[PDB]
Amino acid sequence: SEEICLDHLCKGCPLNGSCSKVHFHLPYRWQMLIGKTWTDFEHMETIEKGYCNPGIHLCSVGSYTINFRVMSCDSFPIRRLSTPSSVTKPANSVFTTKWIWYWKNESGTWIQYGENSNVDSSYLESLYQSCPRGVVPFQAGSRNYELSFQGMIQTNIASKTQKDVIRRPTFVPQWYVQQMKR
Ligand SMILES: [Zn+2]
């Protein structure tokens, strides 16, 4: 499995070294595929900070430049292992990943859904987890839209104007993870 174990981050995984999930000390794990082995980046917190910002799709870390849109780093492919999405576990699970959904506005910036849309990040993330190929109808002001997950775009159904939609996690630094473990 490609999922980071929540029990290992919290009170402890009873499956010890036989767990089917990844055991890492952070809720995220950035890796680069070299040959046939995924290899940990050194400065994961910096990569994560760049990734979580919706207006940042480039991250120069070390010698290599990372492109989040393509999820590659100097040609070589990369990946971000994560803990389960927060909407799939109770609220007590503090180490789950909280995903924010943004749409890019006319002025060029990213706006969180709900900040006015009748859907929010919890709504969209839940729908996406239960169906990743769905289309979500929603309303904002007097306008109506369809949000396509598989295309990750919102479309006004009247004008057919399209706008980009992005899904990114909230950032947590390692020291705050330590605090959470206390
Ligand atoms: Zn485990």
Curated annotation (Swiss-Prot):
It comes from the Eukaryota. Induction: By type I interferon (IFN) and viruses. Isoform 2 is up-regulated by 3'-PPP-RNA. One of its GO terms (cellular component) is late endosome. The modification Phosphothreonine is found at residue 46. Residues 86-167 form the WWE domain. GO terms for molecular function: cadherin binding; RNA binding; zinc ion binding. Phosphorylation by GSK3-beta enhances its antiviral activity. GO terms for biological process: defense response to virus; innate immune response; negative regulation of viral genome replication; positive regulation of canonical NF-kappaB signal transduction; positive regulation of interferon-alpha production; positive regulation of interferon-beta production; positive regulation of mRNA catabolic process; positive regulation of RIG-I signaling pathway. The modification Phosphoserine is found at residue 82. The keyword Methyltransferase does not apply. Keywords: Acetylation, Antiviral defense, Cytoplasm, Immunity, Innate immunity, Metal-binding, Nucleus, Phosphoprotein, Repeat, RNA-binding, Zinc, Zinc-finger. The N-terminal domain is sufficient to bind to viral RNAs and promote their degradation. The second and fourth zinc fingers are involved in binding to specific viral RNAs. Contains a divergent PARP homology ADP-ribosyltransferase domain which lacks the structural requirements for NAD[+] binding. It is therefore inactive. Belongs to the ARTD/PARP family. Antiviral protein which inhibits the replication of viruses by recruiting the cellular RNA degradation machineries to degrade the viral mRNAs. Binds to a ZAP-responsive element (ZRE) present in the target viral mRNA, recruits cellular poly(A)-specific ribonuclease PARN to remove the poly(A) tail, and the 3'-5' exoribonuclease complex exosome to degrade the RNA body from the 3'-end. It also recruits the decapping complex DCP1-DCP2 through RNA helicase p72 (DDX17) to remove the cap structure of the viral mRNA to initiate its degradation from the 5'-end. Homodimer or homooligomer. Homooligomerization is essential for its antiviral activity. Interacts with EXOSC5. Interacts (via N-terminal domain) with DDX17 in an RNA-independent manner. Interacts with EXOSC3, EXOSC7, DCP2 and DCP1A. Interacts with PARN in an RNA-independent manner. Interacts with XRN1 in an RNA-dependent manner. Isoform 2 interacts (via zinc-fingers) with RIGI in an RNA-dependent manner. Interacts (via N-terminal domain) with DHX30 (via N-terminus) in an RNA-independent manner. This is Zinc finger CCCH-type antiviral protein 1. It comes from Homo sapiens (Human). The chain holds residues 509 to 696 of 902 of the full protein.
